[PDB]
Design a protein around this ligand. Structure first.
Ligand SMILES: [Zn+2]
Length: 155
């Protein structure tokens, strides 16, 4: 039981200094301006190595807030967007898993699978009912969540 405010606290909103109440509009014009000023404008060619670490960092930085200027709810729809599209392209490469294998927990009513490399997955009884494509967070592979009915004896 805690307050349901969910305020910002990342380098994103700090990169553009845009309050959590701001909108994409105000952030639009403020972006080209803020970012512009954020770019390097000093006269110093004495940055060995770091010169790149800074350039490449500033690129991902300005872009970081550009989309997720705030919390995840800010603009995460775009993230998963390319994901769901990048996952389908892979299709069935690893293998298919049976719901009878995914250890079901009566505590939270959910199932979870463990890869044979190191990582593992965990989906909710409801989630797995809405989704199907499940990839591993370690090795380049993906499995399919198939729900097959076997046990049938009324509870
Ligand atoms: Zn794996």
């Amino acid at each position: 039981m805690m307050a349901v405010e969910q305020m910002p606290k990342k380098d994103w909103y700090s990169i553009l200094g845009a309050d959590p109440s701001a909108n994409i509009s105000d952030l639009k014009q403020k972006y080209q301006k803020l970012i512009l000023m954020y770019h390097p404008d000093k006269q110093s060619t004495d940055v060995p190595a770091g010169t790149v670490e800074e350039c490449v960092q500033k690129f991902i930085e300005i872009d970081q807030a550009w989309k997720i200027l705030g919390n995840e709810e800010t603009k995460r729809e775009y993230d998963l967007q390319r994901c769901e599209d990048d996952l389908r392209n892979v299709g069935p490469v690893d293998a298919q898993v049976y719901l009878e294998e995914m250890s079901w927990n009566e505590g939270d009513h959910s199932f979870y699978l463990s890869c044979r490399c190191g990582g593992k997955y965990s989906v909710s009884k409801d989630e797995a009912e809405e989704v199907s494509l499940i990839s591993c967070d370690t090795c380049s592979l993906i499995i399919e969540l198939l729900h097959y009915n076997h046990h049938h004896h009324h509870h």
